[PDB]
Structure 1
């Protein structure tokens, strides 16, 4: 039926200059040695990505699909959502959001300058009046950092980001922001993945596992999800949005956004040239996450019914899903999974890697992470979320004129505080660097799910107890998989091995302790693993006084 994209031959050009690595990396050259392996995806590579994501979709739905979709609309009809005022929408614009072509930027939008507010008024009037003329978009490469992988063909090409003008982005929020905050949870309940912290994700997966008499689990992820989303999927997304209780003016803007923007349109490069035409998800529109997650969930639940998955418990985040179900024996399990994949494939959600049944929770990877297990202070099993540290280590070494890696270190330390790789490697390095800089008590930004949080390094013990529990400071006897994977990632990036990190950690610990105050608490709590004569760690008062519920919702 439809091609995901068509191209004119015009290049996908960069915005600014693409920052160069330097001959010395003063903050990370004591973390690892193989700086040659750390690269950032470039705009040049964007044309290789374009080739990989351009293909003809044919989609074939069926009664399982139709029935799931009906149930979802019903669930959506229990939501009432409102328009945001123009002003509220303006003030949700992030501070460095790309500026408008019409001579204003995010600062103006957030301050509600008159020229900006006035332009946005007309953009919106035009949405209400013209339900048809396609809205132009800019296409850009995403620049992100990875470690080279010779197995997977050296360097990944940059993903494609497609977005409309700042004025339109503000209007999308007026129309849809309140739905983004309510609909997913309304139609998916506990299956909606972005509502859980790492420990809560873990707790949910364990409950689900223990509920089954004989559990089986698998993960799924779609190859190039955005390019696989069809015109019809997007219109079906609208009908899910329209099932909510909305004021008429929202309805009208939603429909017009759908027809003029979401279902497709022309793409221009940064130099202003026509680049191509799109007939799939623009990753960059406000509905990217909600849309991906709801469309993934519809296809996936229908595919579970098509395949005969029994008592499925799902967890979905964008195109990433886990299903924990009742095993029907391994022969049937395997065939049910092939049936799952075939249905998803008819639904236009083909797999990156064919999924596979598993019967041990450690072997299931979704959203680049997996549950693992270690022993606590009293010898009890303690489960936690971990991941391959390769990419976090590479990002820990991205250091240029424009970019400091310290914030990346902090983000990982917080999300993955119970992991052996955070505790032994990233914590040791982070604290050593900040001590020597004498910047321990300076606040840092921490990025997650598009939001920034300011954190003081000296509050890490409290934050960690709160997010992960006091046992995050006392885990030992990590698993074979985790020990093997961490040792291997360290060798691969030319980092010191764990025993070296241990002797560094002793020195970092002693030095923090000798400063007293909050620093010494960091020393005692964060590095208790580093000394033979363990200390008794008690709950921290400062931790009871904390609420972190917005960080992971």
Structure 2
């Protein structure tokens, strides 16, 4: 069947859209070539719709069947419960899209009578009606990128397909607890969204080390959500429901599956019928968990069919990395082709074909890779990093255009040990926060697509807990890494690293002069900027942080919120 059908009605914006980065001295101090930075808008929505609309064929074999059997068996070991109204409401991001039924995220979080009463009626309706398709809205995401000189043109907007706020809260009640337990039970250490960056690093290094002769590859499915079939989605349901659950959860999950997850009508922001979906909904609670489980089953079966030897997989939704025992360079290329052929039969054909890789630094999982640097005592330290182009371009946008999501803060947290997050992002944003006098204000950001809230004044403690003390002291990064960072700065017309060090001395001094938590930030975050280094010691606040499952609770992304 076709992933989508369309009426001809346009995808429409909900608020005024801006395509270009403003010319502004503040953003200009981060990067000068403003014309290279763009934001996707509804203008490119029809192009994406064409891209994500195609026919799916799916043929399953004995390899697939066997994997699925193991997974349902693993799933049966899970016991999960419904979330209460209060628990599901508290998971709602403060700026989650408002309901058409006279309330918004604020009313949900505060448990207002109108919101709670509506949500109860939506739940009851799910239990009583397991058939009527539930309406969704389709929107074009507004996201910022830099032009790519090797891709030719600008990216088309991604599309998001989501149900009313009332339904989103019900999704949490029915399935949130499952997102916290099922992926781990089914694929164990292969579930990527349970890991902090330092933990992902540890996993990759260990998978690499355990092979006598490691070969790695990433598999890029062309538009994964669109490749997900109605049968895949019902299989997901059977996996969810293999868990031990109360009857009421079974009913709600079955109903959500038939009325929402397997498909349904799409409306534009003007309320016009826009099309009909028959693939994965991109904006539901189960998008990431569903993708992760379905990618895993198909990929694991594909490894077996293809003769991939001793596969170790890292799965993060549709993002897949496979590390295995090389069979020789010619054999590896043959086996990868076979893998692709099997994934294709299972209805997950490739975008760019996979390529055998024999150097871990060059393997990307979720756009990130493991690199190596030296700690304060000359010890080798591994850390996660990525090309900084998109982070810096978004940072520049965020400095001059209000956004409820501060990607710069999420990048500093996830990529704290990197030379680019330290020298560029920390330097730039601490200077801005001091000028605004808003150092202490909590800010929302995303990690793995879920929403979090922290104060920048708590960064040293958070960074130490997540990444260790050495994150404040790495030096002697690799030529690959330094070359990539310097290239990105040059491309964006940003000041080079040496100029950031000059700026950071003054930012550091300013932070220290304020005493308190600000001075802690100055001493810890910017110890790299001064010749005479302070000896940094463990922060008492770091051990007091509840972060052990900080990533797990985001469920791989969605309409999910947590505060620190």
Note if contact 2:19-2:41 (Cα within 8 Å) is conserved in structure 1. no
- How far has the Cα of 1:373 moved from its partner? 0.8
Give the Cα–Cα distance (whole angstroms) in 2 for the partners of residues 247 and 419 of structure 1: 46
Give the Cα–Cα distance (whole angstroms) in 2 for the partners of residues 122 and 453 of structure 1: 29
- How far has the Cα of 1:70 moved from its partner? 0.4
Note if contact 2:19-2:39 (Cα within 8 Å) is conserved in structure 1. no
Between 289-298 and 210-219, report the one with greater CA deviation. 210-219
- C-alpha change, 1:337 and 1:32, in structure 2 (3 Å) is same
Secondary structure at 2:138 match in 1: strand
- C-alpha change, 1:392 and 1:400, in structure 2 (3 Å) is closer
- How far has the Cα of 1:103 moved from its partner? 2.5
Q: Deviations over 1:368-410 (max 9, x none)?
A: 1000011222222211000000000110111487615993322
Q: Deviations over 1:303-353 (max 9, x none)?
A: 111111111111110011111111212221121111111111111111221
Secondary structure at 1:9 match in 2: coil
Note if contact 2:20-2:39 (Cα within 8 Å) is conserved in structure 1. no
Secondary structure at 2:274 match in 1: strand
Note if contact 1:443-1:457 (Cα within 8 Å) is conserved in structure 2. yes
Partner residue, 1:318: 317
Note if contact 1:306-1:340 (Cα within 8 Å) is conserved in structure 2. yes
- C-alpha change, 1:519 and 1:68, in structure 2 (3 Å) is same
Secondary structure at 2:219 match in 1: strand
Note if contact 1:19-1:400 (Cα within 8 Å) is conserved in structure 2. no
Note if contact 1:396-1:406 (Cα within 8 Å) is conserved in structure 2. no
- How far has the Cα of 1:435 moved from its partner? 2.9
Note if contact 2:472-2:527 (Cα within 8 Å) is conserved in structure 1. yes
Note if contact 2:373-2:382 (Cα within 8 Å) is conserved in structure 1. yes
Between 266-275 and 405-414, report the one with greater CA deviation. 405-414
- C-alpha change, 1:465 and 1:58, in structure 2 (3 Å) is same
Secondary structure at 1:55 match in 2: coil
- C-alpha change, 1:126 and 1:274, in structure 2 (3 Å) is same
- How far has the Cα of 1:503 moved from its partner? 1.7
Give the Cα–Cα distance (whole angstroms) in 1 for the partners of residues 426 and 266 of structure 2: 44
Note if contact 1:448-1:551 (Cα within 8 Å) is conserved in structure 2. no
Note if contact 1:22-1:400 (Cα within 8 Å) is conserved in structure 2. no
Secondary structure at 2:31 match in 1: coil
- C-alpha change, 1:433 and 1:324, in structure 2 (3 Å) is same
- How far has the Cα of 1:182 moved from its partner? 1.5
- How far has the Cα of 1:87 moved from its partner? 4.6
Q: Deviations over 1:204-249 (max 9, x none)?
A: 1111211222211111221111111011111111111121112222
- How far has the Cα of 1:519 moved from its partner? 3.4
Note if contact 1:396-1:405 (Cα within 8 Å) is conserved in structure 2. no
- How far has the Cα of 1:367 moved from its partner? 0.4
- C-alpha change, 1:457 and 1:277, in structure 2 (3 Å) is closer
Note if contact 2:406-2:444 (Cα within 8 Å) is conserved in structure 1. yes
Note if contact 2:39-2:142 (Cα within 8 Å) is conserved in structure 1. yes
- How far has the Cα of 1:63 moved from its partner? 0.7
Q: Deviations over 1:247-294 (max 9, x none)?
A: 222222222221121111111111111111111011112211110110
Aligned CA RMSD, in angstroms, stands at 2.1
2:5 pairs with 1:6: yes
- How far has the Cα of 1:464 moved from its partner? 1.8
2:533 pairs with 1:538: no
Secondary structure at 1:48 match in 2: helix
Note if contact 2:67-2:297 (Cα within 8 Å) is conserved in structure 1. yes
Note if contact 1:73-1:240 (Cα within 8 Å) is conserved in structure 2. yes
In the superposition, the TM-score normalised over structure 2's length comes to: 0.93
Give the Cα–Cα distance (whole angstroms) in 1 for the partners of residues 462 and 283 of structure 2: 32
Gaps of 5+ in 2: 553-564
Between 51-60 and 469-478, report the one with greater CA deviation. 469-478
Within-5 A mapping of 1:260-271: 260-271=259-270
- How far has the Cα of 1:516 moved from its partner? 4.1
Between 361-370 and 204-213, report the one with greater CA deviation. 204-213
Note if contact 2:21-2:37 (Cα within 8 Å) is conserved in structure 1. no
Give the Cα–Cα distance (whole angstroms) in 1 for the partners of residues 293 and 286 of structure 2: 10
- How far has the Cα of 1:89 moved from its partner? 3.0
Note if contact 1:83-1:175 (Cα within 8 Å) is conserved in structure 2. yes
In the superposition, the TM-score normalised over structure 1's length comes to: 0.95
- C-alpha change, 1:245 and 1:547, in structure 2 (3 Å) is closer
- C-alpha change, 1:120 and 1:304, in structure 2 (3 Å) is same
Give the Cα–Cα distance (whole angstroms) in 2 for the partners of residues 452 and 329 of structure 1: 44
- C-alpha change, 1:7 and 1:474, in structure 2 (3 Å) is same
Between 525-534 and 462-471, report the one with greater CA deviation. 525-534
How many residues end up aligned between the 2 structures?
552
- C-alpha change, 1:77 and 1:149, in structure 2 (3 Å) is same
Note if contact 1:399-1:405 (Cα within 8 Å) is conserved in structure 2. no
Secondary structure at 1:366 match in 2: coil
Between 115-124 and 299-308, report the one with greater CA deviation. 115-124
Gaps of 5+ in 1: none
Note if contact 1:395-1:405 (Cα within 8 Å) is conserved in structure 2. no
Note if contact 1:131-1:259 (Cα within 8 Å) is conserved in structure 2. yes
Give the Cα–Cα distance (whole angstroms) in 2 for the partners of residues 497 and 405 of structure 1: 29
Give the Cα–Cα distance (whole angstroms) in 2 for the partners of residues 353 and 314 of structure 1: 19
Note if contact 1:12-1:44 (Cα within 8 Å) is conserved in structure 2. no
Partner residue, 1:192: 191
- How far has the Cα of 1:457 moved from its partner? 2.9
- C-alpha change, 1:513 and 1:3, in structure 2 (3 Å) is same
Q: Deviations over 1:29-85 (max 9, x none)?
A: 211111122211101211100001111110111111000000000001111222234
Partner residue, 2:397: 398
